[PDB]
Amino acid sequence: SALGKLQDVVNQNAQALNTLVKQLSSNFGAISSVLNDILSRLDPPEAEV
Amino acid sequence: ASVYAWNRKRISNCVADYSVLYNSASFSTFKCYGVSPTKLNDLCFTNVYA
Secondary structure, three states: OOOHHHHHHHHHHHHHHHHHHHHHHOOOOOOOOOHHHHHHHOOHHHHOO | OOOOOOOOOEEOOOOOOOHHHHOOOOOOOOOOOOOOHHHOOOOOOOOEEO
């Protein structure tokens, strides 16, 4: 644990990147989190929503 | 069937042409939820029930 100050910064940046990648899996209230599924399932008036 | 004893039929292992249903003028009500009616032939479905 001698080099914990640099490893803390590295872990924080990697964890922020992992959280940002993980946020793509959320649909945020939509029917799906995948854009291609929405574009292949719905007409543009509701696919727009 | 009656509505209290509504019949359910499994549709499986076949190719479904939904363009002959949507373009048919026989149906007064055609309301699709969660899927566009013109995108039906471009998708492949599992667990189809009527």
